[PDB]
Amino acid sequence: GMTEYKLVVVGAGGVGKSALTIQLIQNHFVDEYDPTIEDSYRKQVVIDGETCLLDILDTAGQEEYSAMRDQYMRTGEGFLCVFAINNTKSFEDIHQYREQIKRVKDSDDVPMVLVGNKCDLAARTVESRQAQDLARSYGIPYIETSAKTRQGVEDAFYTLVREIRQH
Amino acid sequence: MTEYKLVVVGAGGVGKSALTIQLIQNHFVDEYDPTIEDSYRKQVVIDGETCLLDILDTAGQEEASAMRDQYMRTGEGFLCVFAINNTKSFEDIHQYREQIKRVKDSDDVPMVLVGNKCDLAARTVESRQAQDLARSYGIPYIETSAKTRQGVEDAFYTLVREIRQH
Amino acid sequence: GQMRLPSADVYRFAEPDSEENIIFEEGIPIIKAGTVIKLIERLTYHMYADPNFVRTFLTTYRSFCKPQELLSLIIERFEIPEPEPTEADRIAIENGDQPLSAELKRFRKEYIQPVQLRVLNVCRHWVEHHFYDFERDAYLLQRMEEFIGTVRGKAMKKWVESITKIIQRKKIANITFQSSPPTVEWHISRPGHIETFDLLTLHPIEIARQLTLLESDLYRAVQPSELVGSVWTKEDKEINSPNLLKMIRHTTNLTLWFEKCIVETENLEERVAVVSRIIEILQVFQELNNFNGVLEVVSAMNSSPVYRLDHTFEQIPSRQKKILEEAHELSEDHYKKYLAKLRSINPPCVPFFGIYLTNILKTEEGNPEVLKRHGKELINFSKRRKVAEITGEIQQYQNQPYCLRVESDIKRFFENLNPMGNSMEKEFTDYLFNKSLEIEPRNPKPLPRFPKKYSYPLKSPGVRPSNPR
Ligand SMILES: N[C@@H](Cc1c[nH]c2cc(Cl)ccc12)C(=O)NC1CCN(Cc2c[nH]c3ccc(Cl)cc23)CC1
Ligand SMILES: Nc1nc2c(ncn2[C@@H]2O[C@H](COP(=O)(O)OP(=O)(O)NP(=O)(O)O)[C@@H](O)[C@H]2O)c(=O)[nH]1
Ligand SMILES: [Mg+2]
Numbered sequence: 001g002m003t004e005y006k007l008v009v010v011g012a013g014g015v016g017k018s019a020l021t022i023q024l025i026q027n028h029f030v031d032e033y034d035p036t037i038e039d040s041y042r043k044q045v046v047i048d049g050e051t052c053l054l055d056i057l058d059t060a061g062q063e064e065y066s067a068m069r070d071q072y073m074r075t076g077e078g079f080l081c082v083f084a085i086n087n088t089k090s091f092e093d094i095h096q097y098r099e100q101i102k103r104v105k106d107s108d109d110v111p112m113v114l115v116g117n118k119c120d121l122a123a124r125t126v127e128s129r130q131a132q133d134l135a136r137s138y139g140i141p142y143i144e145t146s147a148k149t150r151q152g153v154e155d156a157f158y159t160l161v162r163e164i165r166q167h
Numbered sequence: 168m169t170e171y172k173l174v175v176v177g178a179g180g181v182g183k184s185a186l187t188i189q190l191i192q193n194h195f196v197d198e199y200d201p202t203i204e205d206s207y208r209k210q211v212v213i214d215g216e217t218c219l220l221d222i223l224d225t226a227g228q229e230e231a232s233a234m235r236d237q238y239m240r241t242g243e244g245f246l247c248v249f250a251i252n253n254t255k256s257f258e259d260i261h262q263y264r265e266q267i268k269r270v271k272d273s274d275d276v277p278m279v280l281v282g283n284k285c286d287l288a289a290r291t292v293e294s295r296q297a298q299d300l301a302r303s304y305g306i307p308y309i310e311t312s313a314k315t316r317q318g319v320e321d322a323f324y325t326l327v328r329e330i331r332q333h
Numbered sequence: 334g335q336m337r338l339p340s341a342d343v344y345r346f347a348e349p350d351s352e353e354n355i356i357f358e359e360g361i362p363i364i365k366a367g368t369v370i371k372l373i374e375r376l377t378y379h380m381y382a383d384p385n386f387v388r389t390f391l392t393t394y395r396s397f398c399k400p401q402e403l404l405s406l407i408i409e410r411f412e413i414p415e416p417e418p419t420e421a422d423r424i425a426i427e428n429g430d431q432p433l434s435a436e437l438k439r440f441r442k443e444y445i446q447p448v449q450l451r452v453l454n455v456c457r458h459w460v461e462h463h464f465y466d467f468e469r470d471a472y473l474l475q476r477m478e479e480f481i482g483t484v485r486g487k488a489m490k491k492w493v494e495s496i497t498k499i500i501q502r503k504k505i506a507n508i509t510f511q512s513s514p515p516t517v518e519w520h521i522s523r524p525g526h527i528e529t530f531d532l533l534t535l536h537p538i539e540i541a542r543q544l545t546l547l548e549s550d551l552y553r554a555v556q557p558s559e560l561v562g563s564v565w566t567k568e569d570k571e572i573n574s575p576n577l578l579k580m581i582r583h584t585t586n587l588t589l590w591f592e593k594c595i596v597e598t599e600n601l602e603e604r605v606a607v608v609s610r611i612i613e614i615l616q617v618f619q620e621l622n623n624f625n626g627v628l629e630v631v632s633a634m635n636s637s638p639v640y641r642l643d644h645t646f647e648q649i650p651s652r653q654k655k656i657l658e659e660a661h662e663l664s665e666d667h668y669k670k671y672l673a674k675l676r677s678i679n680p681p682c683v684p685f686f687g688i689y690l691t692n693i694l695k696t697e698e699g700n701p702e703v704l705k706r707h708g709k710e711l712i713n714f715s716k717r718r719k720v721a722e723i724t725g726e727i728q729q730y731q732n733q734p735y736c737l738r739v740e741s742d743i744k745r746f747f748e749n750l751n752p753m754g755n756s757m758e759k760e761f762t763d764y765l766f767n768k769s770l771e772i773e774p775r776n777p778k779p780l781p782r783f784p785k786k787y788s789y790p791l792k793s794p795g796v797r798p799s800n801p802r
């Protein structure tokens with residue numbers, strides 16, 4: 001039947017990365033979540049008129065298990081590389097995440113999107129022009145998202161699915 | 168995984184807590200810290216079937232004697248514990264048996280009679296007297312030592328089997 | 334009829350339940366949300382005990398109430414006013430007779446004594462299982478000692494004297510088995526010859542046993558204080574989650590050691606022996622229910638430097654291929670088969686901690702701290718219950734000890750393992766990948782030959798245990 005896309009979220013810990021998938025998969029309109037529930041990470045969606053199933057791997061909280069990253073990344077067809085717009089270190093980490101994905105997938109052209117996440121009201125330290133320039137240097141889209149209002153969340157995942165479809 | 172609610176009852180100081188902690192942690196508690204109410208969980212395979220035991224460890228001191236109905240309502244099987252060197256604790260058994268029957272409104276509640284502290288030489292309750300009482304209740308009698316582990320798994324897992332077959 | 338209660342003006346915990354102060358989930362009730370006063374009332378309720386609730390509350394309350402404020406509130410809960418004499422008591426006293434005091438005696442027996450005992454049970458659990466609050470705030474401990482040490486009256490006396498002693502023991506602060514542990518197994522390396530210890534010279538059975546003891550001890554040392562509030566992900570993680578981080582860093586180091594043993598063995602035949610030996614260690618991990626160890630091996634086999642070694646894995650015996658396959662399948666479909674296996678085995682076991690961490694973090698991040706109802710903010714307690722269900726599962730597997738004997742020299746060897754040396758992570762993992770490219774170059778480059786590095790026999794002793802008399 002319908003195509004299933006295996007997406008993997010990667011990025012620094014401790015800066016709200018998990019809000020991206022929670023807000024997507026959530027009952028959009030009730031703020032509640034049980035991640036232990038069978039298929040709290042699967043969602044059927046319609047993108048450009050084509051129905052598909054998203055299976056999202058987000059291992060948020062396991063960042064210290066650094067030798068497991070290869071195993072987790074190997075499962076994915078497309079990747080969201082997430083940093084926090086108020087944490088410059090998480091932005092500087094993006095280069096090494098992308099290099100690791102390319103190595104695990106043994107490809108120089110892996111479907112991926114760069115996501116800048118607004119996780120609180122603390123002062124932004126990564127300007128949108130900096131992130132756009134980085135994304136353009138890689139040849140990938142850039143999407144900004146809010147961890148509180150759900151803005152940009154659908155755009156981030158749907159843009160990634162379009163990258164997979166057009167690979 | 169089937170869940171079983173076990174309740175350990177009996178007079179103060181007979182070893183209800185020591186029995187439970189020996190089962191849960193393989194450790195013998197030397198201290199006598201009177202319980203108010205404690206609860207433990209244990210995943211264990213019994214007769215090839217995995218289950219989850221919820222064990223309620225209750226207060227034996229008489230000052231808590233008006234607070235028992237609430238835990239007897241929830242329990243599915245009861246370990247009725249006395250100490251084999253304490254005749255008064257053996258005489259207290261029938262009061263627990265009768266209260267459990269009243270609260271659950273049932274003549275057929277899963278129970279095991281436990282004679283604890285069987286590592287001690289100076290016994291004052293003979294096995295035969297306890298076995299006679301158990302037969303009158305229709306339940307097994309198992310002697311245990313929380314100190315050495317003798318009989319401890321047998322007592323708890325026999326109770327599980329009686330809940331399973333209930 | 335129900336007992337009458339003190340006036341809510343003199344005793345705050347007598348206010349009637351309403352949706353402005355407590356909400357229940359759809360046979361004791363389960364609380365969805367409430368004010369802190371209502372949560373403490375139900376924590377110490379006169380009609381029933383709720384030991385699960387005591388654990389849940391004491392594990393999670395600091396997200397909505399400070400420790401000093403909790404102690405003030407339970408002391409306020411404890412201090413219950415007694416009712417005045419009734420009309421019948423009055424008439425008896427006016428006639429020089431002793432009153433029956435029926436209503437007073439019932440209120441003492443059915444309200445004051447159960448509530449007070451349940452307050453003391455909160456104090457007892459707090460000191461026994463959440464003592465870190467008092468280690469970190471000496472004044473909080475002084476207040477608790479003073480409160481307990483000044484409770485009067487004989488109904489509570491046994492528990493007050495007991496709790497006083499428990500506190501004093503905690504301030505200055507043995508396993509028995511059904512059988513004997515199996516005999517320690519030795520291979521090329523003999524007892525006391527620590528300088529020869531290595532992957533292929535220690536007995537694979539004993540490698541798996543000693544790593545299981547080490548990993549079990551690390552698992553058992555993690556307290557809920559290192560987990561609630563997602564503190565292991567935050568800037569102060571080294572302060573707040575040291576035992577968890579030690580456990581994870583051990584797992585990472587062993588995975589990297591496995592990778593390093595493989596790719597630094599340049600001779601193909603020797604490297605096949607190394608990979609085969611690691612799969613035998615994995616087989617014993619499975620037999621011991623050491624799932625952390627199972628995944629340490631699987632993560633190494635799936636790493637970028639090792640996964641690509643097609644010439645090596647082509648020579649692995651078919652049965653060992655099947656062992657690795659079925660270990661890898663535990664992690665597929667978001668750990669579906671792992672979760673089912675963990676819930677079916679007979680402990681002792683060593684769970685993989687990472688799933689717990691992700692579920693705690695997402696429960697915290699995905700649910701609001703408060704619910705707004707009728708203009709009031711109520712503490713979202715359902716969210717805290719979900720977190721404590723996870724910490725309760727963790728604790729349940731921390732109870733059962735392994736019946737295995739420690740070998741102090743093998744233990745020290747694995748405690749001191751340091752595959753990265755002084756190198757930084759990126760440096761080191763690039764080194765491992767470049768070694769992989771050296772020993773099995775990318776097609777169409779030809780496969781080179783390399784000299785042997787091991788002077789001792791490569792044949793495994795196998796993983797079935799031996800038993801002399
Ligand atoms: N259809 C199989 C047949 C097969 C040939 N050789 C094998 C060796 C094994 Cl052990 C299992 C299967 C095979 C295939 O061609 N698999 C390719 C090449 C072999 N790698 C082995 C590998 C390395 N790291 C791993 C981590 C987990 C797991 Cl499950 C396997 C591995 C996997 C990718
Ligand atoms: N020799 C021996 N001592 C035991 C045994 N079981 C318990 N004890 C000792 O008896 C004392 C009381 O044990 P405890 O478990 O606290 O009893 P309890 O029935 O839980 N008391 P309470 O009803 O007040 O909670 C402790 O000193 C304990 O070490 C046993 O099998 N053998
Ligand atoms: Mg006790």
Ligand code: NA
Pocket residue numbers: 086087088089125
């Ligand atoms: Na910054």
